[model samples]
Structures are given as structure tokens and as C-alpha cells.
Target: SANTVFFDKINDLLVASVKEFEGTVGISYLDLETGEQRSVNGQHEFYTASTIKVPLTMLVADTVASGQKKWTDLIPYNAEEDYEEGTGIIAYNIQPEYPLKTLQEYAITYSDNIAKNMLYDTLGGDAKAKREMYQRYLHKTPSIEEPQFSSEDALVILQKLYTEKATKPDYQAIYDSMKQSVFHERMETPTTQGKVAHKIGSYDEFIHDMGILETPHPFALAIFTKGPDNAKSAAFIASVTDKLWQLQVSEYPNQ
Candidate 1:
């Protein structure tokens, strides 16, 4: 009951924010402390982009912990075999091979598509990872290229990361990598305080940012967008997050 007012305003903000936009904005937020939640078009799926790396990181960690792989295991890279020409150092031939953990770091911290593919290959490539991620997280069969995920899907993954993996030593690297993400324009602003372990993904008309926000009242948030005006979409994510943060820190009655 205490969350109704703030979340209602958030609902209004979400509606008005997207009123004239060329595309869509979907968001999901969960208050870890109070177990309250809000969602705006959260079930609408958007192309997963690099945000898929979030669960992919978890799958890799599970494999390593299960002794199927080791963090130090190296994956070979070649221009023709593994070149993904976006958001990573590997394409520049930073190294001919990289450790599994290093690839995981680059996949999250740099949003490196090549590193992500490498890690995906290690865990059985896109088909297998898609099957596993869908079966395990989304509980549905995959459809569409690049594997679409809704805002709610992102929230579920983050909650699992926080609840299932955050405290485990084997999974700490994943958390650390997300916290070090180089892209900051979406869910973070200059005035923003606290750590938001997030992943950003953008391709063509889609831009998404999803993460667990550390605060006095911790929460998980996923903002996904599809529109022609990329800059406006990015700013919208930040503005929504800023407003949510303000409400997150406010004195809610039950808390």
C-alpha cells in the first residue's frame, strides 16, 4: 500500500514520457526491501542485444563451478573466425587468445560481442545457450533473431543474479564485471550515486539497459527501448531511472 503513490506517479511518468515517441519504452522495477514492484509494458519483448550477456555470464559461471570449464581456459580468436566488429578490444587483435574469465569481463564490462560469442561457444554456442537460457530463465521457447527478452525477463535474470549468484565466490567476477561496465549513458547519470551493475545493448533501433541497483532500498530495473531517435531513447532511460532513484530514497511509510 505504501508504494502505490510513488509507483502510480512512475506509471504516469512512463505514459507521458512515451506519448509522442516513435517507438516503445518498457520498464520493470522491483523493490528488494519491501517486495513491491512496478512495470510499464514490461512483458513486451525487444531484441536482447548485449543484454543477453547477463544470463550468458551466469551460464558460464555455472559451468566453471561445475568443473566443466576453468576460468583460465583460453579461447582462440581469429579475424575471420571470431571477429565481431562492435564494442570490444578483441576485434582489434588485442590478443590472439583470451581466458574465459577475461572474455566474461569484456563481454560485460566492454559489451564486447566477440567475447560474448566466445563465451557462448564455450558453453555450447548460440543455439544451446538460447535453449538453456530460455528453459531456465524465461520458461518459454525462443523465437526471433538475436533472441528477444522483455523487461520482465531482464528483471527475472537480475533477481537471480542477485539472489542466486551475488554471494557466491564463483559468481563474484560476473557481478564485478557488470559494475565496471564502460557504457554509462543509459541507466546512469553524473549525479547518480551508488553502484548499478548493468549491461547495455543497442543495435539498429533497439537500446536496452538492465541491472540491479544498489541502494538503501535495493532494486532491480530493466529499461528497453525501440525507436528511430536513439538519443532520445537513451535520455528517456536515464530520466526514468533518476526519477525512480529519487522515489527509492524517499521515506516510504512501511520502510
Candidate 2:
């Protein structure tokens, strides 16, 4: 499922790094058109951090496609949106009244905590609605609950959101949602405008990840990591991501 060098190098790095760290790392890559897949530790769960926003994006997309909402829809944010100290834009306490689109941007680009919480709340907030959506559409069976306040659950939920089955309305909603926001703004390589739709998650101890519908060589990739040394784990994951991008770009030079 992977090039020999790709697997060997990534495996060597994983083995070496895991010796020094105390957590897990999971990754999945798929060629969207061909349905080819490659993974390493893809199912070992780790804290998802802000990556959960990717799943929230899925839910929002589903709602929009169903005519339950719109991209321009406005959602209010109050003091209740605050995340516990660590990472996220909402912690900064900005002026409030963020648009749904802006919140999606914040959730993806800035990994804003309040934006994610608001999204979760807006998507029926951990109720049967969110769960049923996950099971029926995403084909994922991880635990996803509302009143979400932690990074781990957020990650699982996001994974579920990304892979769900979609009706035309669901697909349309997800597509519409992606059309309005900046993705992976914090990452060194931003998706080419209108070419790739994605969301990212980050935190001190984890880097939860997910994405969709990339062009050139359409694909999806999700990565999660946790370790005792936060900085090193982040660096390792970023290096892997860079390598992955290099592989993709080489395959589709037009991208």
C-alpha cells in the first residue's frame, strides 16, 4: 500500500520516536479517485486537539446540504465558548458575533476552540443527531458525544465526519462549506485556493488531523499524534506531512 522507501522511512522514524515518547500516532492516506489507501498506525487513537473541527465541518456541511442551514448563517458566540487554557483562538477573547463561515475559518485555520464548540452546539450538540450522522454517513464507530470539551473526542468525531456517507445534499453542503473559508492557514503550505478543501487540529500534546477532496490527485489524509515531548512530536508529524505533500506533488505536478 506504500512505496518501500515511504514505508521504511516512516516506520523507522516511528519506531525511533516511539522509544522516546509515551503516546501513539495514527495516519491514513487515500487516493480519492482510485480509492487506493495507505496507513501506518492509522487506528491507534490519540488526542485530536483542534482537528475535531474537520468533523464539525462535516456535520455543518450535511446540515447545509439538507437545507437545514446556509453558509451565510450567523451563529452567536458568548462567554460560554471559551476552551480550557492551552491552544485555540477563542481563548483570546475577541469581540464576539462570529459568522458561521468565520467560525469555520477560525476552527480550521486558527483551530479556534470557541468556534468548534459553537459548531458542535449548532450541529445538535452531541445528541442523537450527531451520533446518527456519524454512524450512517461517516462509517466510523468511535465514541462521539456532545458537550464536547476535550481534544481526544473531538479528533474521533472529526474522523467520523470525514468518512461519512453523503446524499447529494450532504455532498453539496460540505462543498459549499469549503468554498467560503481558508484552510490550514497555520501550516506552511496552504491549500491552493479553491483546489483543496481541508481542516486541521492542533494542541500542546496532540496534532489531530483530517482533510478531503484534494485535487491534482484527489485524496484524503488524517494524522494524529501524542507524546511526552510535545515539541518533538509536533516536529515529527510536520516532517511526515511535508514528506507526504512532496509525494503528492510529485505525482501530480500540475497541482
Candidate 3:
């Protein structure tokens, strides 16, 4: 067992800090390397914004992993035909089509709205379907709640991504794919020591982050917030990130 005392300490810090907030927050954390997990109000649901793109990509990636399509499979993209508004240069500037691999990179890594829409469209499914599939596959009941999602969903998704049988090359391929993401706000600190594969999302009254911290002791970490338009949520993410990194593989404490 890793260090329960230290893990409990971190969870205590997370709980106390979350309680002082003005809005709802849910967390899902895990030592993927060790199977030590924790959560605070993880069942609480909130819109994950671009973070939803993570599972969306997983759906497409799962298809690829299932050998339904090759990673090298292509999808034609025209700026006028496949464009939307959001964090993306694919339709706006890149002006082209791409393989499933490149498309996954565009949507998940760059947070390309158009790219995400394309993949979402390709899947031809709604949020409910994906959410239910995501939840049920973990042998858990699905949520019918509005703006459907749970912190535990992230936990289940990454757990399967890391340790489940999603078939050959594709599973490893998906894990390797996250390392290509371009945005890394909350989970951005520890990436310096080792590659951190993560995704972040933001919107009106909401901010969220999730990722697998890659290092000698890799772990899955997620933080979600819904509150007033303020810095506390973002600041909380940064603080927790630094704290977790210190516990993971930092130089050490002066104790």
C-alpha cells in the first residue's frame, strides 16, 4: 500500500478547501500505478465542457482499438464543410481532412471544436448514449440527471483506458495519444518531470480538469468545479496540482 497517511492528508486538504468554496465541486483521484483511489462528492454531476471531448475521443479510439477502423484511416475535412467555432485551427487555419489519429489529436489535444463536432457527428450519438455506455461498461448504473456526468465517470474511463481489455494496439495507442494534447492548465505542473497526459475544460460558471500523471508512479487525477466567475476554482486546481506533484516524485520536504 502506498502511503495512506499522506493520501488521507491530501484528501483532507481537498475536502476542507472544497467546503470553503461558493459552488459545487467533485473530485476523482487515483494512484493508477497502485490502485489507491479517493474522491470528494464524486457523484455530483457537472458539465465537463471540453473535458467531455476526452470520452468522446475514447469512443472513436475504442472504435479504432476494436479494429473497426485503422488509426491511419482518413476523414476528409473542408473548412466550409467541417468547421465550427471554438479552440481549433483545424477548420480555421489547417484547412484539411485527416486520419482518425490526426482527427483525435485535433479534437482532444488542441480542443478543436470543429474536430470534436466532426467526431461526435461521426459517432451519431447523443450525450445520454455515451454517458450510459461509459457508466454501464464499468458495471455501474447510468445517470439520468441533467447535464449528465459524474467524477466517477472519469475514474472509470481512465481506469479502463489504463488497465482494462480494450483490445490490442488501440488501448496503448489511446494512452499514448493523450500525451499529444496541447492544452494542460490544471495538470500542467508535474509535466516537467515526466510526461503528463491530461485534458481541461471551461465554461460559464464551470471549470474542470482531468489527467493521468505520467512518471515513475503514474496516477489519474481529476478536479471539477461549478461556481461564480472567479479565480478560486482555477487557483484551487493549480494549488492541488503542485501539492500532488510534491507527493509524487518531488525533491522532498524539510521535515
Rank the candidate models, highest lDDT first: 1, 3, 2
- Residue 128 of model 3 has an lDDT of 50
lDDT of 3: 0.70
Error of 1 at 193 (Å): 4.6
Q: Per-residue lDDT tens digits of candidate 2, residues 1-255?
A: 345444455455444544554577766666554445566666565554555555666667767777888778888765654454544566777656767767766665555667777787777775554565546544555465321223233334433444554444444445455444444432224434455455555566665445554556655656566666766665665555555665666644321
Model 2: clashing residue pairs?
A: 50-201, 51-201, 126-146, 137-164, 137-165, 138-163, 138-164
User: Model 1 over residues 191-231: C-alpha lDDT tens digits?
Assistant: 46447888889988998898877767788889999999889
Off by over 4 Å in 2: 1-22, 80-93, 128-130, 141-198, 212-218, 247-255
Clashes of 3: 1
Model 3: residue 254 alpha-carbon error in angstroms: 19
Instruction: For model 3, name the residue pairs that clash.
Output: 77-97
Candidate 3 lDDT by residue in tens digits, 1-255: 236765786688678768777788888778765577878988887776877776777778666656677777667665555667768867567645577777777777688888876675566545554654556555554443434456777777778777753454555665665677676566776443347777778888888878787756777888888989547787777677667766767531222
Best by lDDT: 1
lDDT, candidate 2, residue 148? 25
* TM of each candidate vs. truth: 0.93, 0.64, 0.82
Q: Show the lowest summed lDDT stretch of 10 residues, model 3.
A: 139-148
Q: Is candidate 1 or candidate 2 better by lDDT?
A: 1
Instruction: Give the worst 10-residue stretch by lDDT in candidate 2.
Output: 146-155
